[PDB]
Design a protein around this ligand. Sequence first.
Ligand SMILES: *[C@@H]1O[C@H](CO)[C@@H](O[C@@H]2O[C@H](CO)[C@@H](O[C@@H]3O[C@H](CO[C@H]4O[C@H](CO)[C@@H](O)[C@H](O[C@H]5O[C@H](CO)[C@@H](O)[C@H](O)[C@@H]5O[C@H]5O[C@H](CO)[C@@H](O)[C@H](O)[C@@H]5O)[C@@H]4O)[C@@H](O)[C@H](O[C@H]4O[C@H](CO)[C@@H](O)[C@H](O)[C@@H]4O[C@H]4O[C@H](CO)[C@@H](O)[C@H](O)[C@@H]4O)[C@@H]3O)[C@H](O)[C@H]2NC(C)=O)[C@H](O)[C@H]1NC(C)=O
Ligand SMILES: Cn1c(COc2ccc(S(C)(=O)=O)cc2C(C)(C)C)n[nH]c1=O
Ligand SMILES: [Ca+2]
Ligand SMILES: [Ca+2]
Ligand code: NA
Ligand code: NA
Ligand SMILES: [Zn+2]
Length: 806
Amino acid sequence: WTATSGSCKGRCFELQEVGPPDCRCDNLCKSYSSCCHDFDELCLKTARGWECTKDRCGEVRNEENACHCSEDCLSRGDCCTNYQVVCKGESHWVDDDCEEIKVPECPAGFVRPPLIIFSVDGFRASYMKKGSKVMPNIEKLRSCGTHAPYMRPVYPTKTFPNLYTLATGLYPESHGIVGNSMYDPVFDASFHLRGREKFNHRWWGGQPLWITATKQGVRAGTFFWSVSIPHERRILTILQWLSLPDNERPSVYAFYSEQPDFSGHKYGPFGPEMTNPLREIDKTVGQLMDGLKQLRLHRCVNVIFVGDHGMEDVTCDRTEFLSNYLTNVDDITLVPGTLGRIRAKSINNSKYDPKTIIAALTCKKPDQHFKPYMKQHLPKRLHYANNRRIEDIHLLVDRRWHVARKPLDVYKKCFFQGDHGFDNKVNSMQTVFVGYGPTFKYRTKVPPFENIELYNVMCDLLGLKPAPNNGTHGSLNHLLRTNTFRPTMPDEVSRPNYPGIMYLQSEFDLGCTCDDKVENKLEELNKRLHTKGSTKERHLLYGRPAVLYRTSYDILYHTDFESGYSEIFLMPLWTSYTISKQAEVSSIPEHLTNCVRPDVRVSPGFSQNCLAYKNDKQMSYGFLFPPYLSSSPEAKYDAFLVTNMVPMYPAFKRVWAYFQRVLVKKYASERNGVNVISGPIFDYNYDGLRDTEDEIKQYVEGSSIPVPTHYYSIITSCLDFTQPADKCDGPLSVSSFILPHRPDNDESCNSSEDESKWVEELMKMHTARVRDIEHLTGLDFYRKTSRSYSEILTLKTYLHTYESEI
Ligand SMILES: *[C@@H]1O[C@H](CO)[C@@H](O[C@@H]2O[C@H](CO)[C@@H](O[C@@H]3O[C@H](CO[C@H]4O[C@H](CO)[C@@H](O)[C@H](O[C@H]5O[C@H](CO)[C@@H](O)[C@H](O)[C@@H]5O[C@H]5O[C@H](CO)[C@@H](O)[C@H](O)[C@@H]5O)[C@@H]4O)[C@@H](O)[C@H](O[C@H]4O[C@H](CO)[C@@H](O)[C@H](O)[C@@H]4O[C@H]4O[C@H](CO)[C@@H](O)[C@H](O)[C@@H]4O)[C@@H]3O)[C@H](O)[C@H]2NC(C)=O)[C@H](O)[C@H]1NC(C)=O
Ligand SMILES: Cn1c(COc2ccc(S(C)(=O)=O)cc2C(C)(C)C)n[nH]c1=O
Ligand SMILES: [Ca+2]
Ligand SMILES: [Ca+2]
Ligand code: NA
Ligand code: NA
Ligand SMILES: [Zn+2]
């Protein structure tokens, strides 16, 4: 119930929410069906439109008008945004030369530069160049402020998950808005675009920027705008709030546009109908900047122009139907479109079986345009699994396609020509970032970055402490002139042991064999040096990784590689080695095919054993430092130490052996040497975070040897590839991956072919940031470089996409 009989007189767009059943005059009242009777009359004036004209200049104030051109309008804070241009001979902001804003130039009473977040829905990154001729205001912001060539959204590349990730710094699995449609089995409740359930607070996790500001005494304007309130009125409302007395005035404001997404769905991303929406968004930017210039705030406010996701060409005829795959299509519920989520239609149906659904959807048609995954098997870079609202079965849909349950859903539910939601590495899904103002840099281009990083920067711009989030604070310091965040490196929690030779060969009973009893003061002293770390500077180029949790581990040195060996997990946490451009690849000698050697530095009790692998009929083993890249026949024997061995399903060893034998040297050739750090990851509860020993669900049969869920590699070289990786004087270049450790290659439909046709494609799909490996391992990399810490944090957030140029 709402007693809509109270009044909005002098309450229009009030900032406080008055409690039911008293009628509301705040922006959300429309959405709630609760505005006072006179809200439209008083608060949504439209008389005479939005622009001053010569005849209106100096007019007698008529309170009916949408905006004013009377002499008193500046002191009332309610002139039309073009007032000073039309009536007072001023220029539009866009027509002014850009001039560096070295310090905030703010009216008296302003405690800090206000922040205005101008969000545009479906604004694809390439509109900035492709539409530049028709967006002069946006082009001025872009060229004069700080901009990236694109900003990476989160998956799924849908509106609500991205807008709320921008507001919170969290992945959707953590903030809870995992789609624009969701079912929460604990609540037994459904969230939809239409309707009221979506306003219930239990959907919205984390702490969004307006709540962060409010808790810390910084006032915020509205972020959600009722769809019926025209953009011109939204802008006028922000400018009115900016004229409030100091103690009442917000410091952070948001404007939202439903365009160009609305038209992009109808016309496609580059439909000729798209020019007009771009022009109209640019005109709204110009209204805002003219309005700020009138208020003498145009060199005071920081403005962020940011999008939620892009837009791809998608038509009704490019739809895959699950009814062409599944016999039981009526026993499932599908969340459809540019991603699929499948769960049982009835929880009482005990014939429902996810395994048979996955198999029926796997590589069943030659040009199949989606791929099924259990959510824990999705690429870890999507961070899309740890939430009960994400169904166990996920379909990753190819760009330009949809998936639906049955044909009748697509015509009895072509209209549309655009859509979005695909993998957030896809070029068409990328979106925009420009920052303009005193706190941003001037005429500065920054590399692409992920939208999860922006919350921390928005908090920096407002003087706020961010709530805990998934940004890496400091990684975007290069966007900023002032207010940078100067992080310290985390403290190492566990110090390593450095064991020497402590065990005789006969103390081991591992069931291993090696043909190595093949026998010198020249060479003997030299090999002793290698075991004490004499080549460590060659192979550990950026310092040893720090272990950020409590554990027991040993540093082991070798001619060709260094490792941090866990006594708890019986294998390395990390193995580091450098491969120069000149390195040669060799084979494993015949006499050494099954060789595994006890490591006399590490007790039998803290070693793996060969018998466990013999007995586990499903599990084989591989090596972290590859025997193929040994520096000499004699150094090769180190690669067969039991302390370099890790458990590997035979199907995965196909992938691993091709990476080690072919791709590492290919990368060293291309990049002028590479440093590689490789290791295991254990994430059995798919939370993106290192498992403790009691979370491990699978061991090599009969043993305490844990089976990794993934294997990672971090591959680093010099950004200036004229310099070799091991003699690099400037910035670094990195690429990394987190490969799932699976017992089949069902993910790769072409896996019956030679590894040259499918393995690198797999690895590209599982590209990762170093930060993702840090969360998964409790390790901190790049501790000893010559580079600034913020530059290293930017490096650790980098993701190599193998997408073509934007
Ligand atoms: C991205 O950044 C985020 C933010 O930094 C990282 O997420 C944090 O990760 C922590 C570890 O996973 C997690 O810490 C837990 O907090 C518990 C208290 O949780 C509530 O309070 C906080 C603080 O206000 C709140 O934010 C939480 O919000 C979640 O929950 C509601 C839903 O109920 C949602 O609305 C919201 O979206 C959010 O959901 C997300 O997180 C939860 C987990 O909290 C997931 O389940 C969801 O799927 C979703 O992803 C909560 O309201 C605290 O109780 C936990 O403590 C247990 O574990 C510790 C380990 O230290 C142990 O010592 C304790 O004994 C305790 O165990 C007991 O409970 C167990 C479970 O019943 C039981 O098994 C035991 O036997 C014990 O009885 C834990 O400390 C933190 O909450 C989240 N924060 C957020 C916002 O998500 C995230 O990891 C980063 N991602 C990456 C990849 O780096
Ligand atoms: C989608 N949407 C809106 C605008 O909603 C937002 C606009 C901007 C920002 S942020 C944080 O990017 O500045 C967040 C939001 C959420 C949805 C979080 C409240 N109004 N109406 C409507 O349908
Ligand atoms: Ca959107
Ligand atoms: Ca985990
Ligand atoms: Na075996
Ligand atoms: Na296959
Ligand atoms: Zn859309």
